[PDB]
Amino acid sequence: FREMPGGPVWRKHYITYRINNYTPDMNREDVDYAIRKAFQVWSNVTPLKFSKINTGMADILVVFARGAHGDFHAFDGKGGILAHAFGPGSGIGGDAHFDEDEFWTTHSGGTNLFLTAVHAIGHSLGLGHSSDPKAVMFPTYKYVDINTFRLSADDIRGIQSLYG
Ligand SMILES: CCCCCCCCCCCCCC(=O)OC[C@H](COP(=O)(O)OCC[N+](C)(C)C)OC(=O)CCCCCCCCCCCCC
Ligand SMILES: CCCCCCCCCCCCCC(=O)OC[C@H](COP(=O)(O)OCC[N+](C)(C)C)OC(=O)CCCCCCCCCCCCC
Ligand SMILES: CCCCCCCCCCCCCC(=O)OC[C@H](COP(=O)(O)OCC[N+](C)(C)C)OC(=O)CCCCCCCCCCCCC
Ligand SMILES: CCCCCCCCCCCCCC(=O)OC[C@H](COP(=O)(O)OCC[N+](C)(C)C)OC(=O)CCCCCCCCCCCCC
Ligand SMILES: CCCCCCCCCCCCCC(=O)OC[C@H](COP(=O)(O)OCC[N+](C)(C)C)OC(=O)CCCCCCCCCCCCC
Ligand SMILES: CCCCCCCCCCCCCC(=O)OC[C@H](COP(=O)(O)OCC[N+](C)(C)C)OC(=O)CCCCCCCCCCCCC
Ligand SMILES: CCCCCCCCCCCCCC(=O)OC[C@H](COP(=O)(O)OCC[N+](C)(C)C)OC(=O)CCCCCCCCCCCCC
Ligand SMILES: CCCCCCCCCCCCCC(=O)OC[C@H](COP(=O)(O)OCC[N+](C)(C)C)OC(=O)CCCCCCCCCCCCC
Ligand SMILES: CCCCCCCCCCCCCC(=O)OC[C@H](COP(=O)(O)OCC[N+](C)(C)C)OC(=O)CCCCCCCCCCCCC
Ligand SMILES: CCCCCCCCCCCCCC(=O)OC[C@H](COP(=O)(O)OCC[N+](C)(C)C)OC(=O)CCCCCCCCCCCCC
Ligand SMILES: CCCCCCCCCCCCCC(=O)OC[C@H](COP(=O)(O)OCC[N+](C)(C)C)OC(=O)CCCCCCCCCCCCC
Ligand SMILES: CCCCCCCCCCCCCC(=O)OC[C@H](COP(=O)(O)OCC[N+](C)(C)C)OC(=O)CCCCCCCCCCCCC
Ligand SMILES: CCCCCCCCCCCCCC(=O)OC[C@H](COP(=O)(O)OCC[N+](C)(C)C)OC(=O)CCCCCCCCCCCCC
Ligand SMILES: [Ca+2]
Ligand SMILES: [Ca+2]
Ligand SMILES: [Ca+2]
Ligand SMILES: [Zn+2]
Ligand SMILES: [Zn+2]
């Protein structure tokens, strides 16, 4: 099962975001492109509609933070945790908080925001991990370029199991 166990449900269809704050590590244009491109994965396989606002409330608050920051959790440092993604719904939750003591880079063997944000939006929609050794929701990372990116049959099967 590629779904999160429990009853993940948003009951919301038209979803929006704001990028809270821009990282020094990779610049604001390259962030807002990476997070556009992340979102635009799951629209090609969802009936959900995703938009960006510049006024009002973001449903999925994308925020770049470090430390014991709130929410008890903690972000670790360089390495370890890449995101605190929540699960779906209104309020605090439905959100994907990234670690900023992480050093995020668009180079092939450095920490990729695109490939993480995709699963972190997935975590937020109610997806867990996959178990086919070609999937993106597999635990271990495998690097794939931004634009030659494709979801694997298992991963598509898991969002279609959930929203079908
Ligand atoms: C009817 C008559 C009306 C007259 C109107 C006069 C004109 C008013 C114009 C208002 C201009 C408002 C500017 C604006 O919205 O600023 C918002 C910003 C950014 O919003 P946003 O982009 O979400 O920033 C997010 C990132 N973060 C969390 C790192 C801040 O916010 C900031 O960047 C954060 C600012 C923090 C200030 C903190 C001060 C704390 C200590 C002082 C507390 C005093 C309490 C009374
Ligand atoms: C009449 C009774 C007293 C009323 C005066 C009370 C004091 C008002 C304080 C306003 C302080 C303005 C501070 C400022 O520069 O705001 C910039 C905002 C930007 O907000 P935003 O775009 O959210 O910035 C986001 C940053 N990000 C993405 C990295 C997270 O940009 C704006 O939203 C555009 C408007 C900025 C200026 C607003 C105030 C103009 C002057 C107000 C009165 C001055 C009297 C000397
Ligand atoms: C002694 C105790 C009292 C001290 C009072 C201190 C008041 C401090 C006000 C300014 C705080 C600014 C701190 C700061 O650097 O925020 C940076 C962020 C993100 O930085 P980040 O992008 O994380 O990289 C930081 C280093 N960088 C750019 C050189 C590569 O940038 C943002 O997230 C965007 C928001 C930009 C606001 C630009 C506002 C400039 C006006 C500052 C106040 C002017 C009064 C003359
Ligand atoms: C007698 C009790 C009367 C009560 C009347 C209250 C009526 C208020 C009407 C509000 C309608 C417009 C709302 C709207 O479009 O808001 C947009 C912005 C504020 O957006 P906000 O996201 O807060 O700031 C956006 C920019 N950012 C991110 C850089 C900070 O803000 C704007 O762009 C500026 C719009 C100013 C609207 C002034 C309307 C004056 C009508 C006054 C009627 C008689 C009052 C005596
Ligand atoms: C200390 C600082 C001030 C703190 C208080 C500020 C005000 C508190 C109440 C704010 C309520 C704002 C209402 C407002 O946003 O109206 C906006 C509309 C439509 O804007 P729209 O952009 O569609 O909705 C904005 C919000 N958004 C971005 C999240 C989707 O646009 C309007 O429909 C147009 C403007 C109409 C104003 C009419 C005022 C009528 C007064 C009549 C008096 C009759 C006396 C007999
Ligand atoms: C000079 C500038 C100073 C600024 C100081 C801080 C001011 C706090 C402003 C809070 C205003 C929030 C306005 C609000 O309506 O936010 C709504 C968003 C989403 O609402 P949403 O369900 O999308 O639309 C509501 C329904 N509609 C379409 C029928 C209007 O939902 C929210 O984002 C959830 C509510 C957040 C509550 C935050 C309340 C803070 C109170 C303490 C402020 C202390 C400031 C020192
Ligand atoms: C009745 C009135 C109520 C007054 C407010 C009460 C609020 C009480 C609840 C506080 C919750 C604080 C949660 C928290 O730690 O948020 C921190 C955030 C982000 O996490 P963090 O990673 O710490 O941000 C570090 C800087 N960054 C963005 C560049 C990576 O921090 C940021 O994004 C920076 C925001 C601007 C902070 C500028 C400095 C404010 C100094 C004064 C604080 C006054 C508090 C009363
Ligand atoms: C100032 C006069 C001298 C004070 C005596 C100090 C005596 C020893 C105190 C304990 C030693 C603390 C040393 C220190 O600098 O701690 C600062 C802390 C944490 O520093 P640190 O953990 O490096 O910050 C890491 C990064 N961060 C912000 C992203 C989490 O900073 C924070 O965690 C930020 C605190 C934010 C509080 C915001 C308001 C929260 C309570 C509001 C309640 C409102 C209703 C009452
Ligand atoms: C500043 C800008 C940048 C921000 C960067 C990201 C910063 C992250 C801060 C962490 C996020 C903060 C959001 C927040 O409001 O959390 C409040 C928490 C829990 O809210 P809650 O609605 O319980 O959480 C529901 C959703 N959940 C469990 C799935 C997450 O609640 C608590 O923390 C507990 C607080 C004590 C509440 C005690 C009760 C108050 C009412 C008492 C009524 C007494 C009646 C006699
Ligand atoms: C003598 C006993 C008296 C008790 C009176 C009531 C006390 C209620 C507040 C209790 C707070 C206790 C500590 C706690 O739960 O902190 C929660 C988290 C901490 O996560 P953590 O990362 O450990 O925070 C490090 C510190 N920080 C945020 C400054 C970097 O930090 C948060 O997540 C920050 C966000 C907090 C949102 C608070 C919203 C309250 C909404 C209440 C509306 C109803 C009021 C009637
Ligand atoms: C209570 C009298 C307050 C008078 C305030 C007048 C000024 C209001 C300024 C605007 C504040 C925000 C208005 C608001 O509810 O906006 C929507 C947000 C977020 O919407 P969303 O995230 O979609 O959640 C929607 C579902 N909903 C509304 C049922 C929670 O929903 C929320 O953020 C819910 C926030 C709830 C705060 C409840 C505090 C109870 C304290 C104990 C009071 C005891 C009463 C006897
Ligand atoms: C007679 C009637 C009196 C009514 C008084 C109001 C009573 C009801 C208050 C609202 C209660 C909820 C407040 C709260 O927790 O706001 C948090 C929001 C976002 O939390 P949210 O993401 O909505 O989840 C909150 C969950 N909750 C309520 C279960 C804790 O936080 C945010 O949206 C961020 C806001 C950051 C504001 C920082 C302002 C710093 C100072 C700015 C400059 C001031 C210059 C004058
Ligand atoms: C509600 C009543 C009780 C409230 C009690 C709490 C009051 C707290 C007020 C805020 C004090 C700041 C607390 C604190 O030390 O937190 C630590 C932050 C570090 O967080 P952050 O900057 O994210 O971490 C920096 C390091 N980095 C890039 C590797 C991640 O910051 C630092 O370590 C430096 C703190 C610098 C303060 C003075 C800044 C002078 C700036 C001069 C440049 C602007 C001049 C206009
Ligand atoms: Ca980390
Ligand atoms: Ca949310
Ligand atoms: Ca960083
Ligand atoms: Zn957290
Ligand atoms: Zn993963």
Side-chain angles (χ1 to χ4, degrees):
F1 66 111
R2 290 89 184 173
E3 302 104 283
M4 188 175 168
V9 67
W10 214 304
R11 306 178 180 96
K12 201 180 197 174
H13 176 64
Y14 295 98
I15 309 288
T16 205
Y17 78 98
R18 296 172 80 183
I19 311 168
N20 190 258
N21 66 302
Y22 304 116
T23 182
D25 311 340
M26 55 174 289
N27 212 52
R28 67 167 267 182
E29 84 284 357
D30 239 329
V31 171
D32 180 67
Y33 166 53
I35 300 295
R36 180 163 58 258
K37 202 64 184 199
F39 276 115
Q40 285 175 180
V41 176
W42 280 124
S43 54
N44 216 60
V45 283
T46 71
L48 284 91
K49 286 165 169 169
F50 297 94
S51 55
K52 204 172 72 191
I53 57 151
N54 204 66
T55 178
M57 198 216 188
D59 283 289
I60 315 203
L61 183 70
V62 171
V63 60
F64 282 77
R66 66 282 276 222
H69 75 83
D71 74 48
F72 307 89
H73 124 272
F75 294 113
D76 51 285
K78 185 181 191 201
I81 298 169
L82 307 174
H84 175 189
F86 295 87
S90 53
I92 165 52
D95 314 301
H97 288 194
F98 289 96
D99 187 349
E100 227 298 274
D101 280 332
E102 216 62 42
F103 184 62
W104 295 100
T105 67
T106 67
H107 176 281
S108 41
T111 311
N112 194 273
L113 182 54
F114 164 75
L115 295 169
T116 317
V118 166
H119 187 213
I121 289 160
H123 263 297
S124 295
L125 291 171
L127 293 167
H129 283 276
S130 168
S131 49
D132 179 36
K134 57 187 182 298
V136 175
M137 303 190 307
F138 191 85
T140 326
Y141 169 67
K142 162 73 149 170
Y143 167 75
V144 160
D145 156 74
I146 177 153
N147 282 297
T148 54
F149 184 87
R150 315 185 286 142
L151 288 177
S152 196
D154 211 85
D155 299 303
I156 305 167
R157 192 156 286 138
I159 200 80
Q160 282 192 156
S161 283
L162 200 72
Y163 288 92

